[PDB]
Design an enzyme around this catalytic site. Structure first.
Site, PDB file in Angstrom:
ATOM      1  CD  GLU A  35      -3.184  -0.673   0.126  1.00 55.37           C
ATOM      2  OE1 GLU A  35      -3.093   0.390  -0.527  1.00 55.37           O
ATOM      3  OE2 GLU A  35      -4.120  -1.491  -0.050  1.00 55.37           O
ATOM      4  CG  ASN A  46      -8.454   5.818  -3.983  1.00 56.08           C
ATOM      5  OD1 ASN A  46      -7.647   4.930  -4.233  1.00 56.08           O
ATOM      6  ND2 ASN A  46      -8.667   6.266  -2.754  1.00 56.08           N
ATOM      7  CG  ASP A  48     -13.566   6.661  -5.189  1.00 56.52           C
ATOM      8  OD1 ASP A  48     -12.533   7.314  -4.961  1.00 56.52           O
ATOM      9  OD2 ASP A  48     -14.058   5.869  -4.348  1.00 56.52           O
ATOM     10  CB  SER A  50     -11.853   8.705  -2.073  1.00 57.85           C
ATOM     11  OG  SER A  50     -11.370   7.513  -2.659  1.00 57.85           O
ATOM     12  CG  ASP A  52      -6.494   4.897  -0.764  1.00 59.58           C
ATOM     13  OD1 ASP A  52      -7.650   5.111  -0.349  1.00 59.58           O
ATOM     14  OD2 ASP A  52      -6.224   4.012  -1.608  1.00 59.58           O
ATOM     15  CG  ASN A  59     -11.102   5.704   0.391  1.00 61.70           C
ATOM     16  OD1 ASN A  59     -12.238   6.144   0.507  1.00 61.70           O
ATOM     17  ND2 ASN A  59     -10.414   5.793  -0.727  1.00 61.70           N
TER      18      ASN A  59
HETATM   19 CL   LIG Z   1       3.059   5.688  -2.463  1.00 55.20          CL
END
Ligand SMILES: [Cl-]
Ligand SMILES: [Cl-]
EC number: 3.2.1.17
Length: 129
Positions: A35, A46, A48, A50, A52, A59
């Site tokens: 991640e 993201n 959509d 959003s 992270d 999120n």
């Molecule tokens: Cl990253």
């Protein structure tokens, strides 16, 4: 802060992630590797709209407030910037809520696609924990 692998494993275990909801420590270290590359400052937009945030790429649509995500619940009751601290407490506490909400660690796309079904315990091998 960029954590070492074993450094992050020890912090995660101190916060009680080892076998939290059945997920052994190597799952959490594997998820963090793919991640965020163990980088607490990691941010990624993201598709959509959003974003992270942090070591576990939590999120902004559901879990934290970043002031620019439309569907934004703030279920962990934190600004998303709090997830970028060198201290991983906020990220761990929020991840515990996420992993308790139904689909377990499948909430992390990188975990499902790159850790699930693999030898995740390799990620803590050599660590003094
Ligand atoms: Cl990253
Ligand atoms: Cl290390």
């Amino acid at each position: 802060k960029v954590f070492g692998r074993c450094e992050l494993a020890a912090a995660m275990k101190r916060h009680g992630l080892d076998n939290y909801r059945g997920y052994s420590l190597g799952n959490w270290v594997c998820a963090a590797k793919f991640e965020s590359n163990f980088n607490t400052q990691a941010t990624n937009r993201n598709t959509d709209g959003s974003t992270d945030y942090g070591i576990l790429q939590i999120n902004s649509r559901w879990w934290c407030n970043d002031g620019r995500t439309p569907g934004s619940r703030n279920l962990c009751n934190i600004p998303c910037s709090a997830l970028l601290s060198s201290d991983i407490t906020a990220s761990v506490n929020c991840a515990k809520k996420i992993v308790s909400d139904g689909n377990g660690m499948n909430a992390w796309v990188a975990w499902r696609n790159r850790c699930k079904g693999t030898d995740v315990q390799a990620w803590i091998r050599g660590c003094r924990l």
